[PDB]
Design a protein around this ligand. Structure first.
Ligand SMILES: [Ca+2]
Length: 373
């Protein structure tokens, strides 16, 4: 077993060590030891994946998708918080995919695009892209999306061939319109439980997942690999992109970015073809019970009140950990003060490895200071 704390595995996850202003990765933190890694997802490519989902849908569709037969695929777009990078990325992704991108992710900025539908070339028009703001100033507002959808049906009628949304909340809001045209294709983003259920019902046409289960498995699997004596390629491949010695393997695609020591889950489209893999509580059948020696991990969460971490990430971790014979202890902070986590990152001698979700992305050395000796 590893004798010195400074040599024990350290997996940063979900918030990447980096300068908070520039995003430059903190390689001092990443190079703590050669058993230090980061697990996240391919976030910058999320909009590309949403775009590709829509293009693939159109490519395998028939001309009946063109409801008014005018040779144009018309769409309406629900934009979330206009100042938020997620809105910008997703808007850019779908506009570039459809050829309507002009250089701007703003509402009202689009040009005529093009796409293949059922083996024929069509023009594409963004009939309207609009931020869904509540009358209280709230962003990505569900009720505003419902109202906008109803007004869009009234205004554009059967020029609307599909609805695209920066997120699931707004797409589900559109589906609440009393005049939602039956079967009209609609796409969201986030793979929320209700959205995936809707995909299963053939209502929402598709959404996009960050593969939280793959990320949770990767954190634990990296640690399993290291504590069992893997070093180098096997650490980031075994159980991750190919089966490990027990036959376990993450089902979703996962990347490794060597320069920053980051294991990054792909974003995945969620459609009628795979929706059951993404429903609330669904777990990866590719990860089964192992008989490896039991090991102890202390894992931190930067904010106990973060719903994604509380409701999606942590339950995934707790499902997979026992399967990998990891005894997982979890401590959780307040989302504001690093000390809320640091002061709980204690009695480290009880553990074999560590997983850290920092409040501030530049706090790496405060954690490694505790593992020096
Ligand atoms: Ca049309």
């Amino acid at each position: 077993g590893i004798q010195r704390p400074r040599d024990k595995p350290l997996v940063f996850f979900n918030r990447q060590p980096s300068d908070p202003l520039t995003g430059k990765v903190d390689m001092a933190a990443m190079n703590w030891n050669d058993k230090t890694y980061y697990v996240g997802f391919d976030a910058k490519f999320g909009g590309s994946i949403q775009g590709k989902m829509i293009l693939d849908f159109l490519a395998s569709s028939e001309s009946s998708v063109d409801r008014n037969g005018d040779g144009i695929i018309g769409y309406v777009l629900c934009i979330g918080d206009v100042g938020h990078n997620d809105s910008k990325v997703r808007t850019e992704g779908i506009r570039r995919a459809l050829g309507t991108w002009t250089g701007s992710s703003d509402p009202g900025q689009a040009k005529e695009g093009q796409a293949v539908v059922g083996g024929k070339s069509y023009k594409v028009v963004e009939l309207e892209g609009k931020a869904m703001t509540g009358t209280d100033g709230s962003t990505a507002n569900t009720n505003s999306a419902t109202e906008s959808m109803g007004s869009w049906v009234a205004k554009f009628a059967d020029k609307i061939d599909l609805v695209i949304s920066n997120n699931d909340g707004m797409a589900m809001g559109c589906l609440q319109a009393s005049n939602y045209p039956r079967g009209l294709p609609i796409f969201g983003y986030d793979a929320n439980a209700d959205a995936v259920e809707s995909v299963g019902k053939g209502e929402l046409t598709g959404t996009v997942s960050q593969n939280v289960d793959a990320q949770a498995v990767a954190v634990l699997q990296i640690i399993r690999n290291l504590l069992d004596g893997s070093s180098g390629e096997d650490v980031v491949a075994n159980g991750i992109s190919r089966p490990d010695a027990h036959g376990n393997k993450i089902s979703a695609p996962v990347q490794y970015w060597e320069d920053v020591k980051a294991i990054m889950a792909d974003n995945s489209e969620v459609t009628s073809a795979n929706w059951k893999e993404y429903t609330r509580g669904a777990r990866d059948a590719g990860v089964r019970q192992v008989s490896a020696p039991t090991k102890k991990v202390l894992l931190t969460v930067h904010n106990a009140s973060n719903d994604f971490l509380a409701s999606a990430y942590l339950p995934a971790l707790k499902h997979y950990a026992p399967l990998l014979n990891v005894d997982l202890t979890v401590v959780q902070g307040d989302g504001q003060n690093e000390l809320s986590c640091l002061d709980k990152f204690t009695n480290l001698d009880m553990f074999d490895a560590f997983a850290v979700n920092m409040v501030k992305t530049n706090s790496g050395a405060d954690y490694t200071d505790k593992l020096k000796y």
